[PDB]
Swiss-Prot record, chain A:
Recorded superkingdom: Bacteria
Organism encoding this protein: Escherichia coli (strain K12)
UniProt-recorded name of the protein: Large ribosomal subunit protein bL34
UniProt subunit comment: Part of the 50S ribosomal subunit.
Coiled coil (residue ranges): none
This protein's encoding gene: rpmH
Any Gene Ontology biological process: cytoplasmic translation
Single GO molecular function: structural constituent of ribosome
PROSITE patterns: RIBOSOMAL_L34
Gene Ontology cellular component list: cytoplasm; cytosolic large ribosomal subunit
From Swiss-Prot, chain B:
Family the entry assigns: Belongs to the bacterial ribosomal protein bL28 family.
Gene Ontology terms describing biological process: cytoplasmic translation; ribosomal large subunit assembly
Organism: Escherichia coli (strain K12)
Keyword presence, Ribonucleoprotein: yes
Pfam families on file: Ribosomal_L28
Protein name: Large ribosomal subunit protein bL28
Subunit structure: Part of the 50S ribosomal subunit.
Annotated signal peptide: none
Length: 46, 77, 10
RNA sequence: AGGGGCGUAGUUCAAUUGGUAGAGCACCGGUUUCCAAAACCGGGUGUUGGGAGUUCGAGUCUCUCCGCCCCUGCCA
RNA sequence: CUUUAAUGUUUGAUGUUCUAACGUUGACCCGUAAUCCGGGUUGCGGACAGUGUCUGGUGGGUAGUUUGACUGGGGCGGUCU
RNA sequence: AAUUCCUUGUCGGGUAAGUUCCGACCUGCACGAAUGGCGUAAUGAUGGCCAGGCUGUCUCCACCCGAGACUCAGUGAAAUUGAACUCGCUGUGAAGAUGCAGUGUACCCGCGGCAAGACGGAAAGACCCCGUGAACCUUUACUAUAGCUUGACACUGAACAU
RNA sequence: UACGGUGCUGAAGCAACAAAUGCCCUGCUUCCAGGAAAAGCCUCUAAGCAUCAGGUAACAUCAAAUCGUACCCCAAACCGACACAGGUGGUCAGGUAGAGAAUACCAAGGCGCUUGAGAGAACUCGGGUGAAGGAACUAGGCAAAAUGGUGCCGUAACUUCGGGAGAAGGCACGCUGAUAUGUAGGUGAGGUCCCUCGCGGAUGGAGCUGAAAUCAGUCGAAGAUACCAGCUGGCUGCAACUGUUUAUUAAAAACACAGCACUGUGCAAACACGAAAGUGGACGUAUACGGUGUGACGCCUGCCCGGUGCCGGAAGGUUAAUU
RNA sequence: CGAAGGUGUGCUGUGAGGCAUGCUGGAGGUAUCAGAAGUGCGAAUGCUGACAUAAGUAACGAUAAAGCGGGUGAAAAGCCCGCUCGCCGGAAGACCAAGGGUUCCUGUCCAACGUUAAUCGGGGCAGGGUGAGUCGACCCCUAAGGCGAGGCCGAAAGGCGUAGUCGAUGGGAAACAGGUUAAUAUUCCUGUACUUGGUGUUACUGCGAAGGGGGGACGGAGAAGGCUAUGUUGGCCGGGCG
RNA sequence: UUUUGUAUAAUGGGUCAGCGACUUAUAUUCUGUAGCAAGGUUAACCGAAUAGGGGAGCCGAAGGGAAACCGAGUCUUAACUGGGCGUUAAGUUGCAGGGUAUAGACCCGAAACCCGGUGAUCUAGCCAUGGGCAGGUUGAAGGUUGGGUAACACUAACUGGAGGACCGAACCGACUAAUGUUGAAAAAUUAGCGGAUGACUUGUGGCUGGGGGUGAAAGGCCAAUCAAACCGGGAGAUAGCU
RNA sequence: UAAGGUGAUAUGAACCGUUAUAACCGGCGAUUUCCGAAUGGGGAAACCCAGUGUGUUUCGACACACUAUCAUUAACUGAAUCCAUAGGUUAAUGAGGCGAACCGGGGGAACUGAAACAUCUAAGUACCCCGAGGAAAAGAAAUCAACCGAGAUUCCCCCAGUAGCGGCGAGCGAACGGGGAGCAGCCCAGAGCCUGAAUCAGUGUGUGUGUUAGUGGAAGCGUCUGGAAAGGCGCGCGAUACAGGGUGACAGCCCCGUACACAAAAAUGCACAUGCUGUGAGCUCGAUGAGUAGGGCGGGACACGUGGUAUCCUGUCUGAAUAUGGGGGGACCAUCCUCCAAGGCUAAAUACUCCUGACUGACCGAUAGUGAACCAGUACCGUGAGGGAAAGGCGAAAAGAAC
């Protein structure tokens, strides 16, 4: 039965990719928080 | 935005009162109006977004004097 | 969590 | 059951709400009509559900008691 | 003092006509390779409309809340000095 | 009557017998005309009722074919669990006893079964109540408020007529 | 020669018929609900060149980079915590029977589903059959059983004339032979004429393919023999209907619905989303749009404006900021 | 010459306790009197870890089905080979996209992983394997839409939007058959082709835009006709005489 | 543990080990204790600095009265023989403790409110661009040819191929029953069932964001969560309750 | 600085060094792929696609450089429209982003408390946004006092839980004045006479003192137990060194250090001096911040909730005097004191610690202490934001067990 996750690389990068996140300050604040936390993977982009 | 180009008046916030003194947040905005002022020196009409209080000071101060301050302010009339 | 079906009295 | 309302002339209703109960119709009597009615004139009618009271005095005020209405009697 | 007739004044009330503020989601020109915008020309409207402050009305459209207790469970009824 | 409390109203039809159904009656507790009324072919995994066919649905189950259940080998959980040397009865007792009293019965221990009890397991009861708990929703509850609307002043001027 | 393989050689390699959902076809015909854009490409000339440049044509020649390319891909490799009876778009579409991509049996191809071996109890699950009765079961014919195809005959109330209707109900179906040794039909060679001449036309009928019907015979209990494949009728409530809905206990009489009416709205429209700009409404203009209620169709839709709203009026009473 | 710690034993106090010792361990410990507290645990459906119970019980994942011989091996119901049987065959076959990321091939191994064993595996380990002018992507082009110079608006942040610029699920140049690897192929090889640009030569010569026009360019349904894929039969070739 | 009351068939606990809850700051009152004493003591700060300096201040030795004021008295009243409150009685500064107050205030636990973000890879609607719907029926309008009319109308036959038309696979839906309920599966399987050229279905993108969306409307859906999503923060919210 | 050395798991191999070009440490440079403000365009970050110019040539190409936007300035051109202006093209500078807390400003809750709940409280807190610095802000009286005086601002202790505010409930809560820390005053609103005066900012030039590598650094033997001595038992010695760490059990004298004494080619901080480049000192005479103060209306800030409410800020509407004059002295008036707004600048005392060094602890000792003593913001979970673990110890030496 179809579940909530249907993979799509193009959709995933356009929604949460580095350029999509950094386009706006709110996403840039996510990067600032993850940089402050020391996350190994800042965004979802490979 | 709603900013007077002469006096610099900008929106401020306050309270609506009542007979029960209930306070609700509100905004006070300037009485801004777009007017075409005749500047004699350039023999031209220059349009300014001015408040009603700003209109009074233009007569008192002169059209040229206020613009001189505006150029110092870098407001880009 | 789950779906505790019931016969609650009424 | 429980709670509110009601009982006034022959039938339907006013009441004053402490000191003397009216209206409409009906009924009766007399006109008018060949006659009935319709119309006109005149008029008598009431323990104000029953009781016990309250008062100097109760159809009215209070409480029971009959009869007639109106509401409720619910959650599992 | 009244009755006040006229007299100037000071405020308003309408009505009419203007343009010059203001409006134009009319036309035309330019910025310009542009259905934006700005400027220009012109027409129309015009001291309105529209906006600000203040203010009366309206406003479950949207909020913040209240909506008692006793009680042979509660509610209803009754009660609270 | 998707509407009738009394109520299985009364009568008729259908049945051997029909509180349902169908037809009437009207006494409409408490139908009713676009919060539509009455009818209506067709349509309906629509509701109710009836008939034929059909059958293990049943009277009343029997046998058979497979998959489990059972035995062996291998692998190997789970919910639960104060501790147990964990019988019946009658009585008592936080008022329904394996555990108290009295009495009866019972060699020790598996396996296959059935679920009467352990107020069995599951989940700090959804019903009820309480808290000067929460939330949504309603309105002619209260107080506000967006919005809408009124006027004054400002943006906003001239002339003339009364 | 290492079961592989390697090397050499290698015949026929045609026709007819059937035939697509593929191609002609982005066609043709028809309908109303009236069915992208841009660039490449073709062409036209401005300004700017018109000796040049550039264009056209023919050769020669260079260049065509970079990234992906294994494998799974209806699944043990993806989404479901699992090597999970679930889900997941496109392309390909063999033979016999059949209308068919249904279904049954097979081809190509791929598999036997990662615990078995015994036993052959109760009981449970999935099935088979059943004397007699045939809904007596049960809330209820739940379930099961039954019906089931093609051709033909025949088919009621009612109806909006379309329906109802596959109404109901019934008959014939195999095989063999004959009509007719393989028919009607379809396809169509050779041959023979014609051509301003070809992938030609007209004759022509060989050879293939091939129902359907009738008659005769024959077997069985049974010939739509398996799989596949409507139960039917009668009364009535509700909703007109197809549709939509509570993903995960409710598919309905609920919602929607066409239709009807009221009301708002003159277009810088009402309204709505937006502090605003603006956008939708609409590149529409009252034969339009929004809101509300009702809900096809047929016959119809009565009385009340006191209450509450809404609309109109504006004299008077009352009344804010302001003065 | 054996500290704490642990584990026994003995003694002792009204108690929380204390003292001593045997063994374990192998380096710290600490009198007394004061001082300070993360100072004393059985419970909180407490928290974390470990281990029980049910229990060798349920289950071992579609009732499509297996059997035998041989091989390898320490060991074979499960692997390999062979012969049968059974299942799918509009799929349970074949090729892709999306998605995964080496699961592909070979060698090697059986701890763990596989609901059993396992010599086997999508397990572990080590190597190998993905070859493009024509297939895609990239590229050119645009849809919805996104972003958006200036601009308009907005307390700030920002919102909207013009010119523009992105954005395929659409529109745009060209390759087929055969062979070959343990694993790749319209990519490699063989044979035979094609396309778009660049440059040069030769001949003939009006070219030219961000501009114009054409084209690209488009629905639903239905009806046939002409075909092919494909299938059948015959013929032909080869083999067979059961 | 909670109760008038529990062997209770009321709650808790499978067991062990570890962890786990009366603390801290400031101020105030009371007790104990120490120092000084009608006095006591410093704070900040200075300072080689736990000393010393710093008496700024604080408390006490005098109260009465609303207050001005008066004062061992004073207020009340015109005034008190009066009456109320006072006048003999040591306090103050440390330390410890018992309390209180403000802070989370012993610990664990809400349903919620508010703020800023993340989500339409599920689903709902919409937008753009593509795809899918075997086969078999019914035979509308229209058209042609007749018959009929002056011409129609009308009628017959033949062509035609209309439909939210019919039967029925793919596809989509999910009505009944059985199984399954610590499942093969956190909604499925088996046998039947409805739609199946359309208000159909589907792929790939896009858009609408939380008091908001979207909704052929069920308070449905908005990432297994919806009468107000998720994440973080306010926050150790609050909890007269367990 | 050096006799050893090629980072770690983590050996090995092949080597480099040994008296000074091994290595190591520090100063200064060189190089510094791709993404990222990312800046040539685009983009699903670490990729795709260019243009211009210079220089290369094997005629296939190749190598560098430049090309974002905005602000400011200056040139050149350039509409409607004659000049102009808008606009356009260049060239120079500057800004973009990141980062803990602290700071200023623009916005700004609710839970909660009030045993409910509106005013109020929570709270101008949380949070969002803008901007800046090493501090920031504030700051040189239109201030307070009270008839005596004080003399900018900031911070601490008092004043004082006082005066007051407050459904006068909950609660909120000063000032005057005093004691301290630290102190600093100036400029413009204009012209002269003087004159480059003081002072400040640039820079060089030295000195002093740091910082970024380093150098030396005292003094014990014997015996006993024991695997091993730093322990026991003896006898010494150093100490401006008995701080610590390590060494086979507890080391003043074994080692590293420590106390002391020293060190810088180069870079750099700080301070003083000095030289240039700006910068103006002093004197006289003037001038003395107007849509402002004030007022009406609506709010906000002052402890102060409109109250009798001064004072401050202003959204709105008005509107002075101006030194012969104004402001304030908590309604208001008079008197008297005090000050001079409507222009600016200003160190110190104050707040904080992402980071660097040293040191300290009646702080923890692997369920504790940071979530993380371990390759931890990892594995893992979630579409995403986000959430988020478990896991330390052989022995002195691996001598890690040949056979
Ligand atoms: Mg109820
Ligand atoms: Mg409300
Ligand atoms: Mg509240
Ligand atoms: Mg009560
Ligand atoms: Mg109560
Ligand atoms: Mg009834
Ligand atoms: Mg009967
Ligand atoms: Mg009936
Ligand atoms: Mg009705
Ligand atoms: Mg009606
Ligand atoms: Mg029905
Ligand atoms: Mg029957
Ligand atoms: Mg027992
Ligand atoms: Mg008993
Ligand atoms: Mg018993
Ligand atoms: Mg049983
Ligand atoms: Mg049982
Ligand atoms: Mg129980
Ligand atoms: Mg409850
Ligand atoms: Mg391949
Ligand atoms: Mg392959
Ligand atoms: Mg699968
Ligand atoms: Mg799951
Ligand atoms: Mg998985
Ligand atoms: Mg699918
Ligand atoms: Mg099939
Ligand atoms: Mg059996
Ligand atoms: Mg059964
Ligand atoms: Mg059967
Ligand atoms: Mg049989
Ligand atoms: Mg039978
Ligand atoms: Mg029989
Ligand atoms: Mg029966
Ligand atoms: Mg029965
Ligand atoms: Mg049935
Ligand atoms: Mg059947
Ligand atoms: Mg029928
Ligand atoms: Mg009925
Ligand atoms: Mg319906
Ligand atoms: Mg339907
Ligand atoms: Mg459901
Ligand atoms: Mg659905
Ligand atoms: Mg259902
Ligand atoms: Mg309706
Ligand atoms: Mg009506
Ligand atoms: Mg009315
Ligand atoms: Mg009226
Ligand atoms: Mg011992
Ligand atoms: Mg040791
Ligand atoms: Mg503790
Ligand atoms: Mg328990
Ligand atoms: Mg267990
Ligand atoms: Mg077993
Ligand atoms: Mg058992
Ligand atoms: Mg068993
Ligand atoms: Mg079993
Ligand atoms: Mg299996
Ligand atoms: Mg074998
Ligand atoms: Mg088969
Ligand atoms: Mg691997
Ligand atoms: Mg393999
Ligand atoms: Mg093994
Ligand atoms: Mg592997
Ligand atoms: Mg190639
Ligand atoms: Mg390639
Ligand atoms: Mg191609
Ligand atoms: Mg934009
Ligand atoms: Mg911009
Ligand atoms: Mg593009
Ligand atoms: Mg594409
Ligand atoms: Mg067409
Ligand atoms: Mg063919
Ligand atoms: Mg007891
Ligand atoms: Mg018990
Ligand atoms: Mg002292
Ligand atoms: Mg003193
Ligand atoms: Mg006295
Ligand atoms: Mg004391
Ligand atoms: Mg105390
Ligand atoms: Mg249909
Ligand atoms: Mg149907
Ligand atoms: Mg169908
Ligand atoms: Mg959901
Ligand atoms: Mg809410
Ligand atoms: Mg939260
Ligand atoms: Mg808080
Ligand atoms: Mg709490
Ligand atoms: Mg760039
Ligand atoms: Mg409260
Ligand atoms: Mg600095
Ligand atoms: Mg040294
Ligand atoms: Mg002055
Ligand atoms: Mg003023
Ligand atoms: Mg005011
Ligand atoms: Mg007051
Ligand atoms: Mg007063
Ligand atoms: Mg005031
Ligand atoms: Mg430990
Ligand atoms: Mg830890
Ligand atoms: Mg911790
Ligand atoms: Mg551990």
């Amino acid at each position: 039965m179809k579940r909530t996750f249907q993979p799509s690389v193009l959709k995933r990068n356009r929604s949460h990719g580095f350029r999509a996140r950094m386009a706006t300050k709110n996403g840039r604040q996510v990067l600032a928080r993850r940089r402050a936390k020391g996350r190994a993977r800042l965004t979802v982009s490979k | 935005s709603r900013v007077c180009q002469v006096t610099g008046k900008r929106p401020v916030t306050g309270n609506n009162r009542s007979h029960a003194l209930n306070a609700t947040k509100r905004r006070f905005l300037p009485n801004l109006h777009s007017h075409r002022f005749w500047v004699e020196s350039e023999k031209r009409f220059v349009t300014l977004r001015v408040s009603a209080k700003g209109m009074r000071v233009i007569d008192k101060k002169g059209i040229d004097t206020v613009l001189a301050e505006l150029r110092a302010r870098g407001e880009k009339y | 969590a789950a779906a505790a079906v019931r016969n609650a009295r009424w």
